């Protein structure tokens, strides 16, 4: 079976830069008969049907921006973006359709580098509806920051919380290239009404000093 190798596994590039992605096949994809290379390039973003960009090693598709170009022949091809954009952050795939089975490369993940952006922080207390269920989950947002690295710490009645919170971070934005993270504190309705002070303390690199958004137990 034809084997597709891509390089690098992933790369971080700064807006405007020019990137080249490698794709080497274990056997020529150049058909002596019509001097064509049976290779294609796909762009894929999180949970989305991949997009065909390049076909026959170097035929950019109908809608694909010109910053995109494919070259190569036989067993070594490359995809190059002349000046990366925030929207080009995704995963790139090369696949040979010279012979079955069709084969894909492991893919290269492209991440953008940007200027430090500090998180805008918000905290939300459990809804009354949810409290009816017997469970309280307090949400803390970290909206649009740069360096992914961030750190949220929970404090209930100025007490350090530990192992009962869970975070989720979004894919780097396709426009401003930021992240956003949500840390959710989950405790029983019981445990929740038993304590008063609910504190979220964010610690980013764009912050001069740790930030803290909080609420006192109440309707207002």
């Amino acid at each position: 079976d034809i084997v597709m190798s891509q390089s690098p596994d992933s790369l971080a590039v700064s807006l405007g830069e020019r990137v080249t992605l490698n794709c080497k096949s274990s056997q020529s994809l150049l058909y002596s008969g019509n001097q064509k290379n049976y290779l294609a390039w796909y762009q894929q973003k999180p949970g989305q049907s991949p997009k065909l960009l390049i076909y026959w090693a170097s035929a950019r598709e109908s809608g694909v921006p010109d910053r995109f170009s494919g070259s190569g022949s036989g067993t070594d091809f490359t995809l190059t973006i002349s000046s990366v954009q925030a929207e080009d952050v995704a995963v790139y795939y090369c696949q040979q359709y010279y012979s079955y089975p069709l084969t894909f490369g492991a893919g290269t993940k492209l991440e953008l580098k940007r200027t430090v952006a500090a998180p805008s922080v918000f905290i939300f207390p459990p809804s009354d509806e949810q409290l009816k269920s017997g469970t309280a989950s307090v949400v803390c947002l970290l909206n649009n920051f740069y360096p992914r690295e961030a750190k949220v710490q929970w404090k209930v009645d100025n007490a350090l919380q530990s192992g009962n919170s869970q975070e989720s971070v979004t894919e780097q934005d396709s426009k401003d290239s930021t992240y956003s993270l949500s840390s959710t504190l989950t405790l029983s309705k019981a445990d929740y009404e038993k304590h008063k002070v609910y504190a979220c303390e964010v610690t980013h690199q764009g912050l001069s000093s740790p930030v803290t958004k909080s609420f006192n137990r109440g309707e207002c």
Binding site: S49, G107, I123, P126, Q130, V169
Partner: protein, 324 residues
């Protein structure tokens, strides 16, 4: 105009089979073969095989030989792939796609091999700190909790609100269910004048919700009506008792009466409301019937009444339970 629309995501019990569908439209079904691509967890892409509607010719990739069965229904203009005796390693996203020039793809179906049962999500609100208790813009959102299996789909104001929306990736809780939040930033200005509703859809358990997140919000009490059957020890007696517990209501003014078929049962007694430890009242009503009518299976129901009910009236039914 060209479109490939796959079937919904679903759970599959280990050892069971599943049969995904790809509905083609915008071209002549019999013009291009449909290929199936599996996309293991986040990762890797495998090409399962293709089936050519029209000449009925098909090709398999040796890996999938014996695990997949490609077919098509030209009349229906649909292509199928049926996966047999699933195992964890088969949890993945199966993708349908047209021709060897994979220009068009399906949206993908997420097959989840598991013993778990599907579960609808609960949708709670993430209310705004309030007016300028944020500054120029504030943050609000939806917390879609405890649902299974992946995935769910959130959108704001039915696709209108899109700018500055952030639906976080779901998280598997120790409970075993997924939970996720969808936030959006808006100007404190609009906050209060403009309505914000998040549309949540979890196809697996055919549950749609539309929780509208309001900006916070800062005495009659709707009585709860539970019916209890007779104590198994009481079934020693000819003539048993059906109880109706009406609790957590206020004011202590209420009316409770039973009835079987269209006719109203008469032999009962209700007890005077009693002040509960929470400021509301509760009471019990005791309908006495012959032990043999009860075992008859007929359903009896108590009608409660009170000013705090939807239409000042509600009824709960109770009957002999055919237990396993």
């Amino acid at each position: 105009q060209v479109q490939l629309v796959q079937s919904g995501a679903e759970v599959v019990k280990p050892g069971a089979s599943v049969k995904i569908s790809c509905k083609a439209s915008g071209y002549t079904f019999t013009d291009h073969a449909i290929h199936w691509v599996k996309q293991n967890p986040g990762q890797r892409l495998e090409w399962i095989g293709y089936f050519s509607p029209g000449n009925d010719d098909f090709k398999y990739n040796e890996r999938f030989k014996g695990k997949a069965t490609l077919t098509a229904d030209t009349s229906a203009s649909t292509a199928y792939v049926e996966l047999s005796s699933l195992r964890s390693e088969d949890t993945a996203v199966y993708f349908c796609t047209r021709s060897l020039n994979m220009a068009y793809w399906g949206q993908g179906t997420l097959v989840t091999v598991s013993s778990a049962s599907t579960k609808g999500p609960s949708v709670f609100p993430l209310a705004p700190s309030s007016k300028s208790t944020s500054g120029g813009t504030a943050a609000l959102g939806c917390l879609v909790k405890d649902y299974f299996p992946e995935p769910v789909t959130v959108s704001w104001n039915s696709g209108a609100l899109t700018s500055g929306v952030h639906t976080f990736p779901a998280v598997l809780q120790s409970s075993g269910l997924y939970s996720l939040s969808s936030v959006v930033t808006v100007p404190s200005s609009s906050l209060g004048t403009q309505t914000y509703i998040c549309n949540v859809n979890h196809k697996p358990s055919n549950t749609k919700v539309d929780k509208k997140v309001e900006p916070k919000s800062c005495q009659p009490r709707e009585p709860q009506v539970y019916t209890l059957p007779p104590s198994r020890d009481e079934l020693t007696k000819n003539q048993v008792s059906l109880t109706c517990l009406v609790k957590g209501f206020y004011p202590s003014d209420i009316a409770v009466e039973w009835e079987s078929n269209g006719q109203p049962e008469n032999n009962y007694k209700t007890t005077p409301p009693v002040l509960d430890s929470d400021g509301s009242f509760f009471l019990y009503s005791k309908l006495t019937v012959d032990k043999s009518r009860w075992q008859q299976g007929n359903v009896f129901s108590c009608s409660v009444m009170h000013e705090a009910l939807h239409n000042h009236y509600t009824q709960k039914s109770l009957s002999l339970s055919p237990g396993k």
